[PDB]
Amino acid sequence: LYVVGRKKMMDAQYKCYDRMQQLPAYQGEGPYCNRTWDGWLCWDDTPAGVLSYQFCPDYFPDFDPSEKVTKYCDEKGVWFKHPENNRTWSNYTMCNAFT
């Protein structure tokens, strides 16, 4: 089932780049975080100061696809970075918190 999860992940990755290529530039106002593939999920252009969220993916057997992933776009329009390694980091912790 890990072979299938990886395949799902690679399909989503390809689909994410297609989506990011085809959608017009951001139409909103003020600072914002850029659309991005984070490694597991696609995120759209997001206004500064918004905590975006979407369903957990089903790539992994301990992930609950009915839980939510969050990703914080800070008030300068910069995606949250994990303080441990200073790289952009989405919050998947609830995906397998209660397994």
Partner: peptide
């Protein structure tokens, strides 16, 4: 039951 997926630093 399965191995636990890492969601910490160095993951997406």
């Amino acid at each position: 039951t399965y191995p636990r997926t890492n969601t910490g630093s160095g993951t997406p």
